[PDB]
Design a binder for this molecule. Structure first.
Ligand code: EMC
Ligand code: EMC
Ligand code: EMC
Lengths: 136, 136, 136
């Protein structure tokens, strides 16, 4: 299920120091996002840091959203997850994609420039039109 | 992608002390949910509390579900997230929407009556019909 | 919205020591997943453990994915959630479903063999085809 999504590159290292996000396979659900950093960031246990990506998207279609999730291995094996748990990207958001990275475990972890640190999925969304009732 | 969803108001302060949830824009994916509280609740680091909303929905359509997520800023900046991480609302649920609020950070936070504390998205869902195989 | 999904049973206790996952009702969004364990696992506060299910799926349809979520009560009441927060299962994954269980709270918890420890939802997904722009 393909959908064209506009992407703007904000930092000149993207596509060159490290690549633009790509699906691993035609059956992949997520896209890995990489840390756009001038220097590595050490995260102590319990620490949160805001990691730029150097990228912006504009989904535009109000029937689509993106969700940012932890990478599976980072989360399970290293306790490196998202500070907001799941990061919802609305169809009208056009700012830089920023990743809230939280060390939920007990071991310090250093995020290297270019390292894949999160993933993003695109899912259909619906807007509720509420119908007020006083009994179901 | 609009869908009519029945909503029932359980507490008389809703729509008056604070408003019914509304989408910020026609491109918003989520709806913010507000804390329906008689008094402010201080959450110490590591603390979880169950926050009422004063609202119930009945999605009814078995091809739709809701997901409750942290607010982005609360999560990243203040460590105020969900104790169940992501809260799934089934199409047949008709009870009050309750928010499990967890302080995952290091700073105490007080939830004020009426404060937006979570968000909710509506997503299509599929029920699996399993086909048992002994090799893929 | 039903979709046939191939399932393979990897451990002979499945469907016999404990059952194959089933939807509670025709309106349920999620499927509970059970711990396939030879002995109970005590999780101290802050601990993560990798729990087998004894099952594999092969979604196959690149327009569908699965998301593994905490159970609501386990998360809110007991602080038993997922170490990767949300676990994304791609359409091409055909390995065993493994659950990263993390004790995010302050009380030790023992996972019993057969206990329901997570839930899984099936959601449509889209693959982005990026359109590079230099201004939105
Ligand atoms: C770090 C600004 Hg890429
Ligand atoms: C707090 C019952 Hg609104
Ligand atoms: C625990 C191998 Hg079921």
């Amino acid at each position: 299920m393909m959908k064209k999504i506009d992407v703007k590159i904000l930092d000149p290292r993207v596509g060159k120091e490290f690549p633009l996000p790509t699906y691993a396979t035609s059956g992949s659900a997520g896209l890995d996002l990489r840390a756009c950093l001038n220097d590595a960031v050490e995260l102590a246990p319990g620490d949160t840091t805001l990691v730029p990506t150097g990228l912006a998207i504009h989904i535009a279609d109000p029937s689509l959203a993106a969700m940012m999730l932890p990478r599976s291995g980072l989360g399970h094996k290293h306790g490196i997850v998202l500070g907001n748990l799941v990061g919802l990207i609305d169809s009208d958001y056009q700012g830089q994609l920023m990743i809230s990275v939280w060390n939920r475990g007990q071991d310090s972890f250093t995020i290297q420039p270019g390292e894949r640190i999160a993933q993003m999925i695109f899912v259909p969304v619906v807007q509720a039109e509420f119908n007020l009732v006083e009994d179901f």
